[PDB]
Amino acid sequence: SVKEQKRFGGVLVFARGADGSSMDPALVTDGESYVATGNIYDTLVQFKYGTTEIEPALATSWDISPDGLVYTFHLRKGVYFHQTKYWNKKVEFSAKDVLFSFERQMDKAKRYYSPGAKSYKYWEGMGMSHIIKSIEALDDYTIRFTLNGPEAPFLANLGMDFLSILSKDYADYLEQNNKKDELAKKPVGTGPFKFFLWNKDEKIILLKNQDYWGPKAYLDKVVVRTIPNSSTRALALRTGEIMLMTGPNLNEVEQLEKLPNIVVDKSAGLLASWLSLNTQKKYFNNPLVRLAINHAINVDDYIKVIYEGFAQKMVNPFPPTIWGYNYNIKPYEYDLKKAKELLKQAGYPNGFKTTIFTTSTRNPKGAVFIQASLAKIGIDVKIEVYEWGAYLKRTGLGEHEMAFAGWMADIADPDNFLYTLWSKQAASAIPTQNGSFYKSDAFSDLLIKAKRVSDQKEREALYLKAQEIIHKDAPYVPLAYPYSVVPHLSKVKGYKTTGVSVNRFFKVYLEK
Numbered sequence: 001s002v003k004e005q006k007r008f009g010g011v012l013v014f015a016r017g018a019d020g021s022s023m024d025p026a027l028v029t030d031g032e033s034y035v036a037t038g039n040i041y042d043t044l045v046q047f048k049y050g051t052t053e054i055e056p057a058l059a060t061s062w063d064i065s066p067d068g069l070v071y072t073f074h075l076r077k078g079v080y081f082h083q084t085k086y087w088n089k090k091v092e093f094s095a096k097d098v099l100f101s102f103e104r105q106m107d108k109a110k111r112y113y114s115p116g117a118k119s120y121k122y123w124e125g126m127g128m129s130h131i132i133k134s135i136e137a138l139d140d141y142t143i144r145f146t147l148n149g150p151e152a153p154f155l156a157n158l159g160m161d162f163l164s165i166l167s168k169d170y171a172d173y174l175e176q177n178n179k180k181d182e183l184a185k186k187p188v189g190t191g192p193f194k195f196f197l198w199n200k201d202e203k204i205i206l207l208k209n210q211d212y213w214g215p216k217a218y219l220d221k222v223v224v225r226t227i228p229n230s231s232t233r234a235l236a237l238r239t240g241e242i243m244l245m246t247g248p249n250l251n252e253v254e255q256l257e258k259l260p261n262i263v264v265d266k267s268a269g270l271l272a273s274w275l276s277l278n279t280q281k282k283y284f285n286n287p288l289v290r291l292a293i294n295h296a297i298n299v300d301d302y303i304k305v306i307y308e309g310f311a312q313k314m315v316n317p318f319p320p321t322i323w324g325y326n327y328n329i330k331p332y333e334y335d336l337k338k339a340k341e342l343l344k345q346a347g348y349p350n351g352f353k354t355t356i357f358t359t360s361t362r363n364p365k366g367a368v369f370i371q372a373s374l375a376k377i378g379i380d381v382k383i384e385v386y387e388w389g390a391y392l393k394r395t396g397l398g399e400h401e402m403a404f405a406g407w408m409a410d411i412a413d414p415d416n417f418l419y420t421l422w423s424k425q426a427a428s429a430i431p432t433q434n435g436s437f438y439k440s441d442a443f444s445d446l447l448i449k450a451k452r453v454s455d456q457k458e459r460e461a462l463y464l465k466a467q468e469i470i471h472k473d474a475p476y477v478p479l480a481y482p483y484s485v486v487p488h489l490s491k492v493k494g495y496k497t498t499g500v501s502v503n504r505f506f507k508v509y510l511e512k
Contacts, residue, residue, distance in 0.1 A: 013223045016247060039504055093167075126420055238256070311483055321412075348378075356371065367385075418466055438470070
């Protein structure tokens with residue numbers, strides 16, 4: 001089409017607050033890392049851009065047995081892995097690449113990487129080795145999974161970044177050359193962009209993959225810049241040095257949208273932000289302490305200060321844009337007298353000392369707010385600040401007492417929040433994504449039941465009850481569902497703040 005034709009061509013400069021931590025998405029868990037990897041790699045199934053709807057990707061079709069136990073994927077033929085300066089061989093994707101990508105996580109003998117700090121964090125956290133009984137290549141274009149029990153989220157799981165398809169040929173080549181760590185530095189995928197360069201804490205350059213199997217990307221190039229100061233990042237938008245950015249300072253949004261040629265996209269979001277309380281440590285292992293802390297933080301005021309109103313008060317662990325949200329639970333009320341009383345009841349009538357971890361790129365106001373709110377009940381909070389990679393590492397290891405935490409949905413399913421972040425299974429993995437180390441059998445057993453039936457109303461009933469239990473136990477302080485707020489130049493079209501995996505750039509174009 002002629003109007004379609006006019007979409008093609010150009011360079012997009014995207015800016016964000018913290019660099020990625022790997023080019024192997026199975027080794028990391030964070031959105032910043034997935035900005036690059038989500039454009040480089042495909043999965044068996046994918047999410048239609050702007051949505052939470054499953055559509056075909058490296059599998060063209062699939063069949064699922066009616067007991068939920070067997071999933072057979074028919075693989076797309078004639079898909080090739082990228083060619084770059086570091087990988088020049090042209091190799092067709094096949095079933096062995098699925099086996100490599102999954103089996104390396106499932107079987108410790110096939111881990112690939114040397115013993116060391118690298119960990120398959122999502123795989124471990126989610127208990128994927130409990131879920132999957134076997135994976136078989138029935139021929140070079142057919143993969144069959146057999147499960148130990150029905151798993152309602154499994155199909156959507158297969159669209160997640162950690163289950164990206166890497167190249168076995170490339171991995172074998174690096175192994176022969178004693179360069180296995182390069183699998184996570186110089187990546188090879190099938191997606192609509194290919195890797196060109198990664199300068200740590202500065203920029204990543206992606207180029208269009210002209211051989212992509214799907215609808216070709218519009219853009220020729222994407223520069224993913226790291227500009228840690230959010231005011232500096234907005235100034236770079238205002239000068240046109242960058243074109244699209246995440247993470248604005250929310251007190252600058254009103255100024256930006258007034259300006260020539262700037263649009264600020266806003267939608268409700270699939271995000272949650274909270275305070276982790278390390279329930280295995282002193283003080284925070286006492287529910288009454290937890291509750292006191294919950295009643296001592298005025299979340300309505302926090303939303304005004306920190307978010308300038310661009311958020312909704314958090315009640316349940318996941319946002320109301322996902323089905324199964326319990327609208328019957330009442331948030332805990334701001335009530336200083338009650339908070340102080342709770343602390344007296346717990347045996348801490350003169351409070352205590354503790355520490356909160358925060359990141360360097362968050363607004364510094366947030367930690368200061370929590371410190372000020374908790375000093376009102378005699379809790380003396382020391383603030384420790386870490387850059388993002390360090391923060392992810394130290395909180396993954398349980399170093400914190402309190403820490404800010406956040407999650408963007410990977411899939412539109414309560415399991416992706418409640419089980420991945422709050423289950424016993426998730427707490428058992430080290431490093432962990434269950435930053436509160438919340439261990440409740442009653443809560444976790446309901447989540448397990450809710451995997452084993454597929455009907456949505458049946459699962460909803462179980463998830464409603466689960467939300468009651470975690471509310472009662474208060475292993476955290478819920479803060480906000482932040483709105484997704486993305487300033488960009490008016491000429492940048494096609495980006496969507498809605499759905500999951502939002503930082504895929506294949507549909508973005510520059511208006512001409």
